[PDB]
Amino acid sequence: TTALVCDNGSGLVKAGFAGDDAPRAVFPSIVGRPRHQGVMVGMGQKDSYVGDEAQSKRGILTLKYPIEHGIITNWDDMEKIWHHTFYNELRVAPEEHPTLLTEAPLNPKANREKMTQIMFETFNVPAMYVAIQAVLSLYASGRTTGIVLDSGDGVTHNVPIYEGYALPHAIMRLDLAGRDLTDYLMKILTERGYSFVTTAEREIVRDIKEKLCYVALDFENEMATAASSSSLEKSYELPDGQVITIGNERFRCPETLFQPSFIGMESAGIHETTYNSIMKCDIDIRKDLYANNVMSGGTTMYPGIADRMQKEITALAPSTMKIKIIAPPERKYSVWIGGSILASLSTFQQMWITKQEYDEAGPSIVHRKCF
Amino acid sequence: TTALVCDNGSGLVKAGFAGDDAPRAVFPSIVGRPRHQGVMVGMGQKDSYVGDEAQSKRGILTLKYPIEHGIITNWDDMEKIWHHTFYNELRVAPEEHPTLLTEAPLNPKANREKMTQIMFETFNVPAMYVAIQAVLSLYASGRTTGIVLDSGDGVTHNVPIYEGYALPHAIMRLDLAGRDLTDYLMKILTERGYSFVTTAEREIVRDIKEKLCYVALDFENEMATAASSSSLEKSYELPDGQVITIGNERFRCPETLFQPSFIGMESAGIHETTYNSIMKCDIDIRKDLYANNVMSGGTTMYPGIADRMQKEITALAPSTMKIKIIAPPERKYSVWIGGSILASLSTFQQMWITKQEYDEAGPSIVHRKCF
Amino acid sequence: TTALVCDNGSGLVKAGFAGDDAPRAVFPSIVGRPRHQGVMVGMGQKDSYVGDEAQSKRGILTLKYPIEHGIITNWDDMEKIWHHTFYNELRVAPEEHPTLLTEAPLNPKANREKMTQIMFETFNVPAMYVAIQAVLSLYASGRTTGIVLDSGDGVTHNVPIYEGYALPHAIMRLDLAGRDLTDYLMKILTERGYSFVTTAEREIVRDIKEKLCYVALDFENEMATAASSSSLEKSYELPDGQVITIGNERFRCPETLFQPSFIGMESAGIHETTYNSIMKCDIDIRKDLYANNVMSGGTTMYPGIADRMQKEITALAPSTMKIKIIAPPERKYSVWIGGSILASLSTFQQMWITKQEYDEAGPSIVHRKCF
Amino acid sequence: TTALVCDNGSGLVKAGFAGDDAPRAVFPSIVGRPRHQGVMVGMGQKDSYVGDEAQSKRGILTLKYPIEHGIITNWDDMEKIWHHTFYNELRVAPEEHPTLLTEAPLNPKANREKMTQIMFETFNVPAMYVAIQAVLSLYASGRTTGIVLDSGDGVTHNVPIYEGYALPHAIMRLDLAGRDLTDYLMKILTERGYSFVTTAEREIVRDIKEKLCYVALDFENEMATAASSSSLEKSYELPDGQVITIGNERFRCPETLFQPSFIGMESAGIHETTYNSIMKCDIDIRKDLYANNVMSGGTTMYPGIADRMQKEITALAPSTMKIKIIAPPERKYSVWIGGSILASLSTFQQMWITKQEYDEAGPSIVHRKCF
Amino acid sequence: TTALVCDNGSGLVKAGFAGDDAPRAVFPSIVGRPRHQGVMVGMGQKDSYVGDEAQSKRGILTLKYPIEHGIITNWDDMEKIWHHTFYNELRVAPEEHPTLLTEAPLNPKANREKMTQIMFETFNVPAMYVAIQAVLSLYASGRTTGIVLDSGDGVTHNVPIYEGYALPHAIMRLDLAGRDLTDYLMKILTERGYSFVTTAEREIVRDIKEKLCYVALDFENEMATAASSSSLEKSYELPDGQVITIGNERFRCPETLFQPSFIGMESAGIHETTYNSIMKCDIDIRKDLYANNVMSGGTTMYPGIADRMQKEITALAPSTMKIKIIAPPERKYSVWIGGSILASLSTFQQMWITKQEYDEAGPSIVHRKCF
Amino acid sequence: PAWXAXC
Amino acid sequence: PAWXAXC
Amino acid sequence: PAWXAXC
Amino acid sequence: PAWXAXC
Amino acid sequence: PAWXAXC
Amino acid sequence: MGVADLIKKFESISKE
Amino acid sequence: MGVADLIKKFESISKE
Amino acid sequence: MGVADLIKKFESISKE
Amino acid sequence: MGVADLIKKFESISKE
Amino acid sequence: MGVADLIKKFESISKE
Ligand SMILES: Nc1ncnc2c1ncn2[C@@H]1O[C@H](COP(=O)(O)OP(=O)(O)O)[C@@H](O)[C@H]1O
Ligand SMILES: Nc1ncnc2c1ncn2[C@@H]1O[C@H](COP(=O)(O)OP(=O)(O)O)[C@@H](O)[C@H]1O
Ligand SMILES: [Mg+2]
Ligand SMILES: [Mg+2]
Ligand SMILES: [Mg+2]
Ligand SMILES: [Mg+2]
Ligand SMILES: [Mg+2]
């Protein structure tokens, strides 16, 4: 009767059972459809492909994500994702388990309400609860105090918590995320003559980003170095055996997070955004937030990102203060893990929306602890 | 069977056992409550916090005092203070010990009557007595003659005693106290651009007051000096590492006690108030009161306050007379100490209201020696 | 030789000549700079744009205000504002006219001192005086008694005056103002899926606030109504032709003024702040302050604000008393008007700081009547 | 009720029944007519001869093909071919069986439409379907992925398929085929004094090509060898007992496929054409196409052709990739075989154009899956 | 000392002098070489032919373009183009005039660097500048605001400009252009039996495209019409007197620009690409970009293209907005014209790279205003 | 482009 | 010579 | 954020 | 086929 | 503000 | 009520 | 590998 | 440090 | 509208 | 001077 946990993010879907250390399903939130005439009718060709199935056939599919910037925009595709998650990936009947789902803070309310309707009416879940990843990331870190900087494929957000109490007026959110860094990389590679256009190519460029990019701890020095040296150049083999050689794009891509102006945003970079979140908090709480800067989410995996963040925050913050970044290797999974913990606490078993309650209260019930 | 002694002041609660030299409990009279949405339900979050517990979490609590200007206004919060004092701070069963409590002179009668009801009906104390701090301050000074100037967080008062007899028509009371000086300091710091608004910030400003302020022995010369010199400026580190630099606010704050007009009061300053109390006494008693000016209470801790008082009184009083100020370092504790002494005297053991007497006499009994 | 009058507020700059009924210059206190690469060098592109010029090009500028919460933080931008005001908006040589400027009460002293230095050394004004808007608002109301609640873009403040005498210890100031209400509205619109991030978008949201928001005279009933009805919904056309439909945000935004907790402040709302200012005044003056509650400033333009204030004050104040709110339609201009009056009175012509005096006295002279 | 399968190619007609391993009719697509005066009227001389009948009498007939470069140009002759195929070669009534016919990709639409009209109106076939040989060649190879290089007497074409989906924008077609190689050989043999002019002689030269030619795996080395050696010379006996000795024509003929310039074409050779087809495909698909290069068609029978192709493709393609050529011995029959398979699949029985549908829809129906 | 202006596009080379209304040289970017054995040695036969010379002899040359998709791939051929442009077409010594060259946005940096090296080292130009055609197209349109949709033989691109400032993050580029439409037309004509294979034939098909094709304002209605009518059919006379009759290919060819899927691209059509560029711009700028949609480039010459674009954009864009397309008849020349203007402005004479500067700075100097 | 009047 | 305007 | 140690 | 790893 | 008709 | 009138009111108050 | 077997292979693929 | 242990930590915190 | 005139327009804009 | 001693002082005063 273990609760199901499912982090339906914009990039990957991480799902499994409560009370455990890893998702069992980690396939991408991608639904693809053929973009070409089928001819070999005799093989039983499909109309659509999902997740790993879709990426394995990406060169013939217009791969699309149902979720963009944390918002579900394509509900038919989202039900396909869920359907496969429950029956083909986890092999579990939804009727037999309550389910914990996640969402970004400061999202549209309708996103939560529609997701709830589907779980109760299409999957017949007996109970449901929706959590904010930033909160789950502290449960997963073993603590009740700190700022979680959750930076994934969809959105980047900062949520300070102190002694388990949230400070919602200090939530900062940027719609700058891994998907944009990827788009930026697709454009920057143009300079060296490489041209990635299609969605299959987008996934290739994503793979490149994941293996070659790093965070400069001094952007200008890395630029000066690149301009005078081959030592920063790396090769990568494309799926067709073609070799692509990449230079300073390796650090100019993630630099966007510190300089969003690179993609046209006037918005503050992540170190200033984090800093501002601290500044919006009562002065008495600042010391503890600085000492508990918690990173989570896939884009926090760039080598050097934690080090760059420390350097940047210490340049904004007053001196004579401990500024500490917590960045465990499971940054990709801490949200799922938090879900795994929360759903297993006895203290949480009164937080579930029972289908019976939903059916009498209507959607307003999903906003208990809306935050 | 040692009596409990508890000075439930407006600032701090000083409590312990009779016959000893210090309170064991010295936590603040503060009850705080969360002012933000709780999210981490799994941590067992509280509805309210008390004393040191509350100040340790002040950045998320609307810290409030149950007592203002010496009057208890919030009785639910006051029972929480007492509850913790008895069971968590002193670790003592109230039923096993008689209790000595204190109050300001010239307070509402109801304050005494309600406090009594609670001690007899909620804490089941077997006996009770209520004392005036100004009297306790002379027991603690080893003498039966003098004027006690008790200036705390709540109120400031002057009570002349001669050969143990009180002169009640000469009691002077000002509702100017440390809490107002603190509020004034919060406002005066505005001039240099610092802005402390919240109750947590109020406590920060209080800490500043306690470490940087001093009494000018010549206000105009200190102003002239400040206007021409950096030598009076001091820095202070705020909890978030931010440094605040404070100039003449260091002496303009406590000056309020000599010039209440600074906060809008038309009332006499403390040196004139003391003087007037002496003038209301029979001429034959004045010499002894001048020779025994006794200071007690936390606000008498400003450096230079005793020296300023001597200078001021000698400017009002006729010449050719000894004007003497007694200001032992335990000004913060002399009241508790007086309680510790009084409750231990055999002569005092007939002064207790036995619960049995209260239950037959009703509240009028609490006014024996109302004063 | 008519004095110039210039209300250099944080939102708008209202400027013109003394002895008249309206400012001639009413452009915003905004300096913008290009945030994008210029390419058409042949058009003579500028580095910066000011006021209406800047808003007319806002989609390409990082529009910023030089003044925040009533304090000037960017002096270079402020000189640009003044420069244009004097030479391009009013078309007047500063050397030929004395100038009356305004500032919030309880601001940093340095703000006044620096402003003075600039007027005497950069604009060569022959004379200068600085006034408090709350005072000017009573001159503009034709009276010498009352409380002015001046609530603009920058700060909100309460200054009681009685028979022309001020009661400075009763000044209340909140750093809750129209700019915060705007920021709150930007956040609240998130719930319906609308997302305004950039500074140009901030100005759009401000325009929305100004046309759609109103004050609930019963917050809970308006919420209950909104929850059950489309009758409170209004549409607005965004600059690109996109229609945005807004529901209960119409009254949840201005509600912040009554419930500052909505944006994280623990501070009293404006009706309690006003009430407290009255309570800090001598009891003998309260009747006249209640009968002369004067509203001024741009945020007092929300429909229903005066009515809500009456309802709230009458719930705090004792019964059997006349509580009257004065809210003429020129709430946006009453400050400028007061300046226009004051500068024209013969009684005021000795109040000017002559440049000659400044040059001998130094900055301390600007604090005559500092208040 | 077994479907008839008939690959009416430009060279040979391969026909038989679905569900079997070989055509039963494999006669040439040749209709000949006497080119000389008949004199022995008493023998019942014919006006025309078909297929093997015609070749057996070729020395007196102007043998012609009805199909050139994959296009039917002589419809009267084509009906004769079909007539004999159905009644004299296969001995089957067309009315009793549905029929699967084939055609080149990128042919004129009219070729398909006219063929359809004839089958429905002249042969009364109850149903019809037209397939592309390149597709049939993968069914016959047991796979759903790869590029079929079908090089016959008529045309040479490349059609990539991935997971059964076709990539039509990557279809490459050359009008260089076995008939041109034959014409080239007729010309090249001139150098040694042999002269083949007539159509009967064309068929003789074709026979020579089929037995003596091979693909050089290094053209220049074979030329250098021929220029210095008799070891590459082979004899052939012409029908009249005359011996013809052939030297480097043995490899200079098929070389045309790699160097079309030999016959005046500026077009890419077959290895570059294949390569380009791969390059027109999404990068993600290239690896699988390289690993599944499928050869079919009669001209792929030259000894050494598969080996030359591997050598050439690996010189164009990036290194570190598996380049694999599939060349089963039944290259002459794989198309017919694919037809035999396709027509037998239950999945295909809805693909047939029923005569009833044709008669209501008209010719547009033949382009379902036109490709 | 008039600057030379030379738009070395992929299709045509437009070159002449600054300060004038037309290029003097408008020959094609084609270098051809004989593909056949020369025999009449006595006529002084050439190795290569250029531009009009080459097209005049196209039936014997493998005509090739040095530039493909806006990138120079064959530098030897490009120097021949330049050589002839300077000495045989314009009859001018390069040493005597500075030269303005053009390039596509988002091209490889090396393309600019190599072009620069050649102009300074091979042609000894005293100074050089490289411009982006999209910018030049607004100078030529007399305005500083709008989106230029430049669609030529090489690439199609969208560059929004506002008040002369560029919005580089909103640049959209497709590698769909007139050369692809031509290739598509070569393929589509197959359906009616016409077959154009060689490069000379490619140029013939291009001529056909230019005279017969038009944009359907309703694709499905034109298809339905074609399917039922001869009224859309047009004849064309091929160079050998052969008449070719063309049906719906007349509009199915340019339709590719709206439906790139026709040639295998998954990419957005030009109306969605334009729309997306607007969406990437700040909301405040959208109104002006919609009102200034500027078309330039040779493929914008199809009849009906501007009308189709308006219809399409108004179906994507919100209603109640003016959507305006600017399409002057000189769409083929607006780029050259912009060059003619820019090079003549006094404001531009500091933008030139002086050879002296290049020789000290190296290639990085060419990226001033890289964009 | 996923929000409702801003992305 | 079999196409219609090319072979 | 405009004051000096509080906003 | 003119870019470097895409056309 | 703590008394009853004066603070 | 208008600056000309408000001035007259205040000048009168000052003089009185 | 023979039509009977190739049919079985493709029927299996279609069903799967 | 693993969910089983993190649960024990949080259950202990909630109870305390 | 012609280069001579477009130049005059832009020179005027630059100077202004 | 300490409560134990101050008590002794006051008890002595009361008795005397
Ligand atoms: N060094 C110091 N200088 C001046 N005032 C002080 C100092 N230390 C503490 N105080 C003040 O003493 C007051 C506490 O008063 P206290 O007499 O101990 O308790 P209560 O006022 O509750 O009877 C507070 O207003 C506090 O700020
Ligand atoms: N109809 C309206 N309703 C509510 N607020 C308004 C309205 N019109 C303008 N405002 C607000 O008034 C403020 C401008 O204040 P104003 O007093 O004119 O200048 P300042 O604040 O600079 O002294 C802005 O925050 C603006 O949004
Ligand atoms: Mg996530
Ligand atoms: Mg006390
Ligand atoms: Mg104002
Ligand atoms: Mg064939
Ligand atoms: Mg061009």
Author numbering:
A (entry chain H), B (entry chain B), C (entry chain D), D (entry chain I), E (entry chain F): 5 to 375
F (entry chain Q), G (entry chain S), H (entry chain P), I (entry chain R), J (entry chain O): 1 to 7
K (entry chain C), L (entry chain G), M (entry chain L), N (entry chain E), O (entry chain A): 1 to 16
Question: What did the published study say regarding this structure?
Answer:
The most commonly used one is Lifeact, which is a 17-amino acid peptide derived from the N-terminus of the yeast actin-binding protein ABP140. They bind specifically to filamentous actin (F-actin), and when fused to a fluorescent probe, their derivatives allow visualization of the cell cytoskeleton by fluorescence microscopy. In order to address this, we solved the structure of the Lifeact–F-actin complex using cryo-EM.
We therefore polymerized actin in the presence of phalloidin and added an excess of Lifeact to the formed filaments in order to fully decorate the filaments with Lifeact. The average resolution of the reconstruction was 3.5 Å, with local areas reaching 3.0 Å, which allowed us to build an atomic model in which we could reliably position most of the side chains. We could clearly identify densities corresponding to ADP, Mg2+, and Pi in the nucleotide binding pocket of actin and a density corresponding to phalloidin at the expected position in the center of the filament. Lifeact was well resolved, and we could unambiguously fit 16 out of 17 amino acids into the density. The binding pocket is formed by the tip of the D-loop (subdomain 2 (SD2)) of the lower subunit (M47) and SD1 of the upper subunit, where the N-terminal region of Lifeact is almost locked in by the protruding D25 of actin. Although Lifeact is in general a hydrophilic peptide, it contains a hydrophobic patch formed by the side chains of V3, L6, I7, F10, and I13, which all orient to one side. Interestingly and contrary to what we have seen before in samples copolymerized with phalloidin, the D-loop is in its closed conformation.
